[PDB]
Amino acid sequence: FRKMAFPSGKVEGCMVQVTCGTTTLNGLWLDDVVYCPRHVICTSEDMLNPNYEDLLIRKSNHNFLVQAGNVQLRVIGHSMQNCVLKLKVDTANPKTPKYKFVRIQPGQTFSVLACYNGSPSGVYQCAMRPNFTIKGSFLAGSCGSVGFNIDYDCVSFCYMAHMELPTGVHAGTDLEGNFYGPFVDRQTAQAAGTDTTITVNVLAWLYAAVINGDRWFLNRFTTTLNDFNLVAMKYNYEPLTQDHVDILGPLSAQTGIAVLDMCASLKELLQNGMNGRTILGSALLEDEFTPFDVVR
Amino acid sequence: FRKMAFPSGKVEGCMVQVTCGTTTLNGLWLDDVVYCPRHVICTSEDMLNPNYEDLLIRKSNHNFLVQAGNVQLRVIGHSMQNCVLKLKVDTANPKTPKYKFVRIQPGQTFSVLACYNGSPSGVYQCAMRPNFTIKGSFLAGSCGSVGFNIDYDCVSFCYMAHMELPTGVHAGTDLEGNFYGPFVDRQTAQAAGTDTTITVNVLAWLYAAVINGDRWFLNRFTTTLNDFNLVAMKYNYEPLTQDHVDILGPLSAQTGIAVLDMCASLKELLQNGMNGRTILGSALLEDEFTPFDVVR
Ligand SMILES: *C(=O)[C@H](C[C@@H]1CCNC1=O)NC(=O)[C@H](CC1CCCCC1)NC(=O)c1cc2ccccc2[nH]1
């Protein structure tokens, strides 16, 4: 049971390089618009107290160099939506897939296509952590790399990287420029809050273990939502909600293990450990598969 | 320091669906040849003792249905090279990338594009295990999916999946149809040998941890090569060879830590565990980064 990223080809055809002054980063080219973090227009002096609308006012199209591989794309307009810069360009991207912009919630998963200076380097699967950060690519120049899900050849773009936080994780926005988490695109002291394990995803992963014949951790016991959350808080797991219980419904129907039965298994695992056993392949409980990921 | 798969777009444009009778799986369309596992010509009565020369001589070109998306490719020739079938087709793939065929060795890494009925479903990075199998979440219908590296826009194809072993891992061939390991394309009792940890890769990754500022696991000890292997084999670690020591040389010189000194650290990590700590972000000794990967 490997974590898999989505095939990245549809996104690879959209990655471009965007340069403003001395700063170069990645941009996303869909139709005749290139999207990228607005902080590309900032010099170091601006980064401490940026006035973004005024800085964009002082910029012209000729300040923006956009290159899609060998071809330079002529910028013919520029505007801002929240924290995302929108560069209108000469030419519509002939490789634009069917796509949508969506905003995801903490705990949901997606693939990141790590890019350096407009060229894709690698792809990985991750989850939006409860503290609204993403485990880092650890690749310089990754600003502007995007996160996405693919559903029947429609690409749902959900993330763009704006920053690396001191712990290596990155922070960023949706494609409408709205930050995930309490972070700002200014040079200031910012840090990831204390993170928690995504409980509903661990439960999904235990159901995957059961579907794949790994059942030693099942027991006769059951728990209540409130009793579980008391243990959850103790081991810094996200509280489980009734909505979480409901989305696990199809897995509970498929396996015969009610969610509160599996919560009893998880509670025992947290309080007593694994006794040298493994689940699927791991001595560690995995939390970067959603219920949806497990069904599919 | 995330494990990443290569961007898969160059391989996605080569994946097709190959059908022979009732049997459907994945093929690789490069230039005017489609490569796929030869057991596509097996019926249900053929799995236990297939006679491939006899099964193939009875086929004509029109017995092979090849579908590239919504387009049928016309097969105009067919032949067998070891365990891989080669279908010559009407049309050279216009999306053929620069490519080579390479045979890899246990411990080397590559990306797998997992596919179902010719359509890419996900991508992941892995290592060829010492027992010549791949730990892969491989759906029904993933036969014919391929493994690859990408270097300077050249795709090196090293692997094609042929079957699942009873323990959930898969086995396959190079693109000349020669199996990795002692496996055969026959439904027999064949099982993966005991898997071992890839020692040289763990050591390379500990060097990467030192380079990125982790040092907590270092100690004041050294070891002889023979004493290390005597201990490491008690944890199901692969033995370290003088070739492996030579390969680690550049990282030794970069860090100022002798190879046998790092080996002493590994010995202590196996004895002590991590004690709640992390190395490059993980709670596990990672063995799927090669020295080449790390030096890069
Ligand atoms: C964007 O591509 C680069 C990516 C890496 C990280 C730093 N240098 C690189 O090549 N990231 C940046 O350019 C941002 C710019 C931000 C400035 C502050 C807030 C808005 C955008 N810088 C960082 O991501 C950054 C700087 C920094 C300094 C000290 C600790 C952490 C840290 N992260």
mmCIF file of N, CA and C in Angstrom, chain B residues 77-132:
data_model
loop_
_atom_site.group_PDB
_atom_site.id
_atom_site.type_symbol
_atom_site.label_atom_id
_atom_site.label_comp_id
_atom_site.label_asym_id
_atom_site.label_seq_id
_atom_site.Cartn_x
_atom_site.Cartn_y
_atom_site.Cartn_z
ATOM 1 N N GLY B 77 2.963 -6.402 -37.036
ATOM 2 C CA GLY B 77 3.909 -7.465 -36.778
ATOM 3 C C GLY B 77 3.959 -7.744 -35.294
ATOM 4 N N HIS B 78 4.491 -8.913 -34.954
ATOM 5 C CA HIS B 78 4.589 -9.287 -33.553
ATOM 6 C C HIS B 78 5.737 -10.265 -33.377
ATOM 7 N N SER B 79 6.368 -10.192 -32.213
ATOM 8 C CA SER B 79 7.451 -11.097 -31.869
ATOM 9 C C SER B 79 7.625 -11.053 -30.363
ATOM 10 N N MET B 80 8.424 -11.987 -29.870
ATOM 11 C CA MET B 80 8.663 -12.183 -28.451
ATOM 12 C C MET B 80 10.152 -12.038 -28.202
ATOM 13 N N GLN B 81 10.520 -11.204 -27.230
ATOM 14 C CA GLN B 81 11.895 -11.116 -26.760
ATOM 15 C C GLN B 81 11.874 -11.465 -25.280
ATOM 16 N N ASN B 82 12.373 -12.659 -24.951
ATOM 17 C CA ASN B 82 12.290 -13.183 -23.595
ATOM 18 C C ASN B 82 10.839 -13.115 -23.130
ATOM 19 N N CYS B 83 10.531 -12.421 -22.029
ATOM 20 C CA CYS B 83 9.166 -12.410 -21.520
ATOM 21 C C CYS B 83 8.361 -11.184 -21.950
ATOM 22 N N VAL B 84 8.842 -10.403 -22.914
ATOM 23 C CA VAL B 84 8.125 -9.222 -23.376
ATOM 24 C C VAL B 84 7.672 -9.432 -24.815
ATOM 25 N N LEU B 85 6.409 -9.111 -25.067
ATOM 26 C CA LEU B 85 5.859 -9.116 -26.410
ATOM 27 C C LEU B 85 6.105 -7.753 -27.052
ATOM 28 N N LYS B 86 6.486 -7.761 -28.329
ATOM 29 C CA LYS B 86 6.706 -6.538 -29.097
ATOM 30 C C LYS B 86 5.766 -6.537 -30.296
ATOM 31 N N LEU B 87 4.818 -5.609 -30.284
ATOM 32 C CA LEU B 87 3.861 -5.411 -31.367
ATOM 33 C C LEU B 87 4.331 -4.235 -32.214
ATOM 34 N N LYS B 88 4.726 -4.511 -33.454
ATOM 35 C CA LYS B 88 4.966 -3.428 -34.399
ATOM 36 C C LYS B 88 3.627 -2.856 -34.841
ATOM 37 N N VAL B 89 3.509 -1.532 -34.852
ATOM 38 C CA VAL B 89 2.240 -0.912 -35.211
ATOM 39 C C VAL B 89 2.422 0.018 -36.406
ATOM 40 N N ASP B 90 1.261 0.481 -36.898
ATOM 41 C CA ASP B 90 1.067 1.349 -38.061
ATOM 42 C C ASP B 90 1.836 2.653 -37.984
ATOM 43 N N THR B 91 2.006 3.174 -36.779
ATOM 44 C CA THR B 91 2.200 4.593 -36.550
ATOM 45 C C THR B 91 3.243 4.744 -35.462
ATOM 46 N N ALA B 92 4.227 5.608 -35.691
ATOM 47 C CA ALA B 92 5.181 5.929 -34.639
ATOM 48 C C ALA B 92 4.536 6.881 -33.639
ATOM 49 N N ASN B 93 4.772 6.639 -32.355
ATOM 50 C CA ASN B 93 4.125 7.462 -31.346
ATOM 51 C C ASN B 93 4.642 8.900 -31.461
ATOM 52 N N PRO B 94 3.793 9.878 -31.803
ATOM 53 C CA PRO B 94 4.288 11.257 -31.926
ATOM 54 C C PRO B 94 4.778 11.829 -30.610
ATOM 55 N N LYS B 95 4.390 11.237 -29.485
ATOM 56 C CA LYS B 95 4.811 11.701 -28.170
ATOM 57 C C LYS B 95 5.964 10.886 -27.599
ATOM 58 N N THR B 96 6.632 10.070 -28.417
ATOM 59 C CA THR B 96 7.811 9.340 -27.956
ATOM 60 C C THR B 96 8.842 10.317 -27.399
ATOM 61 N N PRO B 97 9.269 10.174 -26.154
ATOM 62 C CA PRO B 97 10.352 11.021 -25.649
ATOM 63 C C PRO B 97 11.701 10.445 -26.058
ATOM 64 N N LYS B 98 12.752 11.213 -25.787
ATOM 65 C CA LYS B 98 14.086 10.635 -25.807
ATOM 66 C C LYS B 98 14.144 9.531 -24.756
ATOM 67 N N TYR B 99 14.638 8.348 -25.134
ATOM 68 C CA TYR B 99 14.567 7.227 -24.203
ATOM 69 C C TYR B 99 15.694 6.234 -24.439
ATOM 70 N N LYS B 100 15.942 5.418 -23.412
ATOM 71 C CA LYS B 100 16.833 4.267 -23.454
ATOM 72 C C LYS B 100 16.215 3.152 -22.619
ATOM 73 N N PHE B 101 16.701 1.934 -22.836
ATOM 74 C CA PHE B 101 16.401 0.790 -21.991
ATOM 75 C C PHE B 101 17.633 0.500 -21.150
ATOM 76 N N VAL B 102 17.438 0.301 -19.849
ATOM 77 C CA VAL B 102 18.530 -0.017 -18.940
ATOM 78 C C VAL B 102 18.075 -1.129 -18.002
ATOM 79 N N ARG B 103 19.019 -1.948 -17.555
ATOM 80 C CA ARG B 103 18.733 -2.931 -16.524
ATOM 81 C C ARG B 103 19.309 -2.411 -15.215
ATOM 82 N N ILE B 104 18.506 -2.433 -14.157
ATOM 83 C CA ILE B 104 18.987 -1.888 -12.891
ATOM 84 C C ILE B 104 19.354 -3.016 -11.943
ATOM 85 N N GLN B 105 19.867 -2.650 -10.781
ATOM 86 C CA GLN B 105 20.289 -3.597 -9.775
ATOM 87 C C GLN B 105 19.526 -3.344 -8.489
ATOM 88 N N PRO B 106 19.350 -4.374 -7.662
ATOM 89 C CA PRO B 106 18.719 -4.183 -6.351
ATOM 90 C C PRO B 106 19.367 -3.032 -5.594
ATOM 91 N N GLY B 107 18.530 -2.217 -4.954
ATOM 92 C CA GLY B 107 18.962 -1.001 -4.305
ATOM 93 C C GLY B 107 18.815 0.247 -5.155
ATOM 94 N N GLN B 108 18.773 0.106 -6.480
ATOM 95 C CA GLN B 108 18.609 1.294 -7.296
ATOM 96 C C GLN B 108 17.140 1.702 -7.305
ATOM 97 N N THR B 109 16.907 2.988 -7.550
ATOM 98 C CA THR B 109 15.596 3.589 -7.416
ATOM 99 C C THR B 109 15.046 3.980 -8.779
ATOM 100 N N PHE B 110 13.732 4.145 -8.826
ATOM 101 C CA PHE B 110 13.039 4.544 -10.041
ATOM 102 C C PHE B 110 11.593 4.863 -9.682
ATOM 103 N N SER B 111 10.916 5.556 -10.593
ATOM 104 C CA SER B 111 9.498 5.857 -10.459
ATOM 105 C C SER B 111 8.686 4.823 -11.222
ATOM 106 N N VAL B 112 7.512 4.488 -10.693
ATOM 107 C CA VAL B 112 6.570 3.590 -11.358
ATOM 108 C C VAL B 112 5.315 4.382 -11.677
ATOM 109 N N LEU B 113 4.906 4.364 -12.939
ATOM 110 C CA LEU B 113 3.617 4.936 -13.313
ATOM 111 C C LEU B 113 2.595 3.801 -13.317
ATOM 112 N N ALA B 114 1.774 3.732 -12.268
ATOM 113 C CA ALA B 114 0.759 2.687 -12.164
ATOM 114 C C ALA B 114 -0.418 3.004 -13.076
ATOM 115 N N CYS B 115 -0.823 2.020 -13.888
ATOM 116 C CA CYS B 115 -1.842 2.216 -14.911
ATOM 117 C C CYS B 115 -2.872 1.094 -14.885
ATOM 118 N N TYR B 116 -4.093 1.420 -15.313
ATOM 119 C CA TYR B 116 -5.181 0.451 -15.405
ATOM 120 C C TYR B 116 -5.786 0.550 -16.795
ATOM 121 N N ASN B 117 -5.774 -0.565 -17.527
ATOM 122 C CA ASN B 117 -6.373 -0.644 -18.861
ATOM 123 C C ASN B 117 -5.860 0.475 -19.766
ATOM 124 N N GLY B 118 -4.573 0.793 -19.624
ATOM 125 C CA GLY B 118 -3.928 1.774 -20.459
ATOM 126 C C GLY B 118 -4.034 3.211 -19.991
ATOM 127 N N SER B 119 -4.702 3.484 -18.875
ATOM 128 C CA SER B 119 -4.792 4.875 -18.466
ATOM 129 C C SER B 119 -4.037 5.094 -17.157
ATOM 130 N N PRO B 120 -3.148 6.082 -17.107
ATOM 131 C CA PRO B 120 -2.332 6.296 -15.905
ATOM 132 C C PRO B 120 -3.199 6.643 -14.705
ATOM 133 N N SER B 121 -2.876 6.028 -13.578
ATOM 134 C CA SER B 121 -3.643 6.217 -12.361
ATOM 135 C C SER B 121 -2.849 6.864 -11.226
ATOM 136 N N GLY B 122 -1.552 6.616 -11.133
ATOM 137 C CA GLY B 122 -0.759 7.223 -10.077
ATOM 138 C C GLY B 122 0.705 6.939 -10.316
ATOM 139 N N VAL B 123 1.546 7.659 -9.582
ATOM 140 C CA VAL B 123 2.984 7.518 -9.735
ATOM 141 C C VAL B 123 3.620 7.520 -8.353
ATOM 142 N N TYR B 124 4.675 6.723 -8.206
ATOM 143 C CA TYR B 124 5.372 6.648 -6.929
ATOM 144 C C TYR B 124 6.832 6.305 -7.167
ATOM 145 N N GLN B 125 7.665 6.710 -6.220
ATOM 146 C CA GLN B 125 9.088 6.431 -6.228
ATOM 147 C C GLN B 125 9.346 5.193 -5.378
ATOM 148 N N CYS B 126 10.232 4.313 -5.845
ATOM 149 C CA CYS B 126 10.536 3.108 -5.075
ATOM 150 C C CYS B 126 11.978 2.690 -5.305
ATOM 151 N N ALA B 127 12.388 1.656 -4.571
ATOM 152 C CA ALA B 127 13.627 0.943 -4.833
ATOM 153 C C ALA B 127 13.315 -0.504 -5.191
ATOM 154 N N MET B 128 14.121 -1.052 -6.087
ATOM 155 C CA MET B 128 14.158 -2.487 -6.291
ATOM 156 C C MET B 128 14.703 -3.142 -5.026
ATOM 157 N N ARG B 129 13.885 -3.965 -4.372
ATOM 158 C CA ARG B 129 14.306 -4.583 -3.119
ATOM 159 C C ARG B 129 15.422 -5.590 -3.374
ATOM 160 N N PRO B 130 16.248 -5.861 -2.355
ATOM 161 C CA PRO B 130 17.269 -6.908 -2.506
ATOM 162 C C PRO B 130 16.716 -8.255 -2.940
ATOM 163 N N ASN B 131 15.460 -8.570 -2.640
ATOM 164 C CA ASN B 131 14.891 -9.836 -3.093
ATOM 165 C C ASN B 131 14.276 -9.729 -4.494
ATOM 166 N N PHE B 132 14.563 -8.644 -5.215
ATOM 167 C CA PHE B 132 14.156 -8.425 -6.605
ATOM 168 C C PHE B 132 12.660 -8.192 -6.769
#
